[PDB]
Write a protein that binds this ligand. Structure first.
Ligand SMILES: [Cl-]
Ligand SMILES: [Cl-]
Ligand SMILES: [Zn+2]
Ligand SMILES: [Zn+2]
Ligand SMILES: [Zn+2]
Ligand SMILES: [Zn+2]
Ligand SMILES: [Zn+2]
Ligand SMILES: [Zn+2]
Lengths: 503, 503, 503
């Protein structure tokens, strides 16, 4: 659907539906009781009758309202005025979009973006409304055969801003919100696709199409197994040795800045299109969710699509490290000692800790880009899920300023991350009697030792690690990819590009 | 809430709200056209404009409808006409109640009970509506300190019936639906109570209050541990021996028939207020759900309540076999050989198969009432959950007519059961080199060999066994007791008392 | 052994042994060459033959060195000059103490305290040396019947400081170091004692002896089961119900400040003398290590012993929440709903998550002291061990300044903690359909949800929680308590008492 911003009163609107809010208890909102006084207390009369107490989730749809230009007035329960946090705000917009679609409204004017949301300005509210509206419309039915497509008469939504002063921030919010929502959808699509269709070659193919769609700034390269071997990326090669799928590393280069002294921000996404655990096989229960083990590449692709659309004035390189981990007569095994691209040797203790064996070689490989900073994004350890659950991404880094920036972006964007420490006592857990290091450190500090492992390959540049094992998708009835952390990364890049989201 | 029936037209009601259906696609219910044709096509116009497609789940609330004597008109989507089964029908009524409760309607008149529902007459559609509506209002907040009580402005609902020829079947449907819904609530309340509060003594106490509330026809006796020993109920005693809670068997006698030859129907409910498994201890995951191991006794109590309310002209005795299975220094052990009340000996191989050791003695105990039929109700085997899932109760019996009466009742009441076979080959699985029989027959056929076991104690009367391990409760976010098989047993009693089917 | 400081040169010492450093490669320490020149290159000569490369862990004991007033000269490999972190520094000191004890040296003078250690001044270097030396001498043979008591001729060590200007900081360092080491030692002894001896009565007995030994500023109260019942601490009671050991909350009050407005700092330690998990029984493997489930109480006791010795001018109350979690006919069970002292109800899903059930009642109880700050210390979750491993303590709090003061103290003291987030999405995992909350929130974010659970009882004051499940003890061959976080808490108390940092 389309979005736009205007600055006008409810009573002057001539829409299929205007949306205004109501707070507990049956407390018409400022903007709404502007409309009440047009219909002569018609609305407040209905609220005295108990038609809408204002509880969250509650709604009231009025037709043929006395002296109201719009055909419908949709009132939404907003809880309690300032006492509105971002989370309840997102729900109010979700409800609005869903309610409107059970209606015949082909468009609507929404005054909810004017609500007081603790600490968030106009830009944030409009941007979050767009991102939430789009999230609500998501569906993954491309593999179903029944389905007669969903009902969506709502084709456009206009968000109202307080004064003409907010139209500018309002428009920026819409532009940004749509590009990030698109990056999120793309990542959710790639994540939800089965390993059956979304394999390393499928990712390479999406990478090429992205370049074709933005040929003035995007160039894609795809490195195969033979080139990997020539480059000495034996660790990455070992992981996919067992699978019949070819390991393919897709490099998407976006050039938005022409000065010769510009340095690129490199994003490295773990792309295990399926992870069975390998010889160190995973249990049966819920293993189909391992199709999400490539959600890091999914997010990096979404971010690139976002950067290209917004044409940011910076240089970004996204790597989709495609691979597949399968058991078999050619599978690598516990006990193997791999010679990484960097030259350091790694003793494999568990073949299911393969993401870091793919990433280490990509981390050495990306130094040819002389990056400003490298950030890897990966569904890496179950330990991180135990540590930070499904709500916050785990972050580790070898440079404090870069960590601070990523955490600030995670908060601004509402796609949170939390820093976990690295450190010598944890490095020691990787000691090996046979190679420079082992690929695991045992249960204690599992998410930290994995980051420590990665840090031995990133000493030549400032770097951060995002472990999205718990935030990349949900299980249960609503099993599905979240698209995280596209928003955190998009915010990060928006900040780097100079945009002031605080104004 | 309260329910009643009338037979009028929508247009002539003077209610806070009249409910009517709409079928896909946006086709107003005929019962409604008289009403539309009074507002000047006010409803049909809103419908072609897209306000209610008619899909199940959708609703449309209208106030100030042109010339309508009722203040609110609530239209509910019903899908396609004569393609409505009772499951969809119930959802429709469930939706109606929830939607009405979001308005200020103090009472309402509903015409949905006139919907065509496959195989169901007026009596069933009204009774089903009553039972479903009451199911929807269920809440268990007695142990919470927050809460401020849900919003129920709707204190009364009037169901409409086609003609005055259906008023009496409608009133009977309400009388029956209310009594059964109340038994189901009593059983759900008991099941949901913690083992902490709901122990054998609590069930006994509830049993005594029931007798007090209907002292004319109900007498309750409680048999404690000293008496059980004197009765020789050693098997029952061994299960609760490890627990500090005293084992208590509550016998509720309902006499609604004075004829010297009116043999009682005996209901025996497994009342394990907590089942840790004992020495054969259960795993931690979801063990909190073992407070539901007394759901058989909960159901029986519910039926006794139901029968007292309806004053059926039959004799029914309900036994609440209270007990607690705990591990400890005085707990019975795998290997023990128990001398059951029948005199037959039993080798205990697994202490978690304790419900049948509590029941075998109670089934011998009840032969003193010279029962015409005996029915045990028990959350007995994980095997039944695997066999019939959470939707259908497992049934076994030593008498075919009785088993057919029960299945029919299960169908009529929409609380289904399915008969499983018994047999000599399953009996052989209970062979012991040390006793007359072992208490388990291995994994193959676990629900059936449990029935075989019980059957060695029910040879002197017509008997049926209901394994409600999968139907007694549900888990997940909506964790809670279901109250089943109260409806099945109530229908069985109603049928024994002469219920015509009202056809 | 005893410690003291002095500022002198190596050549003028008349000790049984002087300890000096040697850097790699075979480079004689500046303080050394002074000493070499008296014996005339007699030392550098030996370093040329290669008698000490100077690598960490290497040593060289020299007797009758020409012209040296000291009989023995112990040279120690220190690695490389300024690039010495505190970690390697402590190792060098530990080595020194161990090596010295294989000789006849009855006393020694050590110039290693003058080594350059990144970010650590004279005060820290002397204090780390003292704590590490005492740490090295720890043994726990009180329950062994063989042995013949260790060989420790070295009854005194003197650390040299650069000039007389560092003498005072040196003395203060020794004073603090000794008191913290004593505290740490008491915590380790209590932790190491078997559940067989160290039960809740034992902890109470120790708390009473502490009060007796410092009757001027310390008073101890012991609250038993009858009292807890009268206080409404049913949550705490339920956890110990199953065990024959009476639950006992020992309260150690230290009044070091006579002013009316010196509000107390309250420390609460989980004192589960043994944790079998209860009905939700733990696995066999390494369950003996559950004797360490009272290390929180252990640390609070040691911290109290330390604040008593130093006589800090502040008020501190240390609570030792003793309890034992056993399975049995009287144990509380999964499903139980407890009414905590605060009045909030808690549904028990897992009995092994008992520490928080003991702590919530104690956290409510301590509000009677109107504390300025409350800090609980508990071996609480396996999740924490997974999240932060064995090296860093997990910290949660409801007041940021308190959290920052604690993180700062942990760094300063070399007993690290790392903050983890709390939050609404985590609180929601504790939702229950039967109580105000459940005691566990699932595996995702286990450490954090435990934090969220405790925080529901600490809203009336500034609070912090330390989960030392991973830092409190180590297993394997060197199995034993660590005494952490005694040093972190002591440093916290010192800073509150006005400690300088010493420039
Ligand atoms: Cl193969
Ligand atoms: Cl016991
Ligand atoms: Zn893996
Ligand atoms: Zn993986
Ligand atoms: Zn059992
Ligand atoms: Zn049972
Ligand atoms: Zn525990
Ligand atoms: Zn514990």
């Amino acid at each position: 659907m389309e979005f736009s911003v205007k600055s006008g009163s409810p009573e002057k609107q001539r829409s299929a539906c205007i949306v205004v809010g109501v707070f507990e208890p049956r407390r018409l909102s400022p903007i709404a009781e502007q409309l009440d006084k047009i219909s002569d207390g018609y609305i407040s009369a209905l609220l005295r009758r108990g038609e809408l107490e204002g509880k969250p989730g509650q709604t009231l749809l009025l037709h043929h309202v006395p002296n109201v230009l719009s055909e419908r007035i949709l009132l939404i329960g907003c809880g309690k005025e300032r006492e509105l946090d971002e989370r309840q705000y997102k729900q109010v917009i979700q409800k609005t979009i869903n309610t409107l679609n059970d209606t015949g409204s082909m468009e609507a004017v929404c005054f909810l973006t004017e609500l007081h949301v603790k600490g968030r300005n106009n830009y944030w509210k409009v941007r979050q409304a767009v991102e939430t509206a789009k999230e609500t419309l998501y569906s993954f039915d491309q593999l179903k055969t029944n389905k007669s497509e969903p009902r969506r008469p709502l084709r456009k939504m206009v968000f109202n801003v307080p004064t003409r002063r907010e139209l500018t921030s309002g428009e920026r919010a819409i532009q940004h919100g749509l590009a990030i929502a698109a990056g999120i959808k793309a990542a959710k699509d790639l994540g939800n696709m089965p390993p059956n269709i979304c394999n390393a070659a499928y990712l390479a193919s999406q990478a090429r199409q992205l370049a074709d769609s933005y040929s003035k700034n995007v160039i894609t390269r795809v490195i195969g197994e033979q080139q990997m071997k020539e480059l000495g990326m034996h660790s990455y090669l070992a992981v996919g040795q067992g699978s019949q799928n070819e390991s393919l590393m897709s490099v998407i280069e976006y050039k938005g800045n022409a000065s010769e002294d510009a340095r690129p921000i490199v994003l490295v996404g773990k792309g295990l299109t399926f992870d069975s655990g390998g010889i160190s096989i995973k249990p049966s229960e819920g293993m189909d969710e391992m199709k999400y083990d490539m959600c890091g590449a999914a997010a990096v692709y979404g971010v690139m699509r976002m950067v290209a659309e917004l044409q940011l004035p910076i240089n970004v390189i996204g790597v989709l490290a495609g691979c597949e981990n399968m058991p078999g007569g050619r599978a690598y095994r516990p006990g193997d000692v791999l010679t990484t691209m960097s030259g350091q040797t790694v003793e494999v203790l568990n073949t299911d800790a393969e993401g870091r064996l793919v990433l280490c070689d990509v981390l050495t490989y990306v130094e040819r880009f002389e990056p400003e900073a490298v950030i890897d994004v990966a569904t890496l350890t179950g330990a991180c899920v135990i540590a930070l659950g499904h709500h916050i991404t785990g972050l580790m880094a070898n440079h404090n300023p870069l960590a601070h920036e990523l955490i600030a972006a995670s908060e601004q964007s509402g796609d949170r991350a939390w820093r976990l420490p690295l450190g010598d006592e944890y490095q020691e857990q990787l000691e090996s009697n046979f190679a420079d290091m082992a690929n695991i450190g045992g249960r204690p500090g599992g998410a930290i030792t994995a980051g420590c492992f990665l840090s031995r390959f990133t000493r030549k540049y400032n770097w951060a690690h995002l472990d999205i094992a718990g935030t990349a998708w949900r299980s249960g009835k609503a099993k599905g990819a979240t698209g995280r952390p596209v928003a955190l990364l998009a915010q990060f890049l928006l900040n780097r590009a100079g945009f002031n989201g605080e104004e």
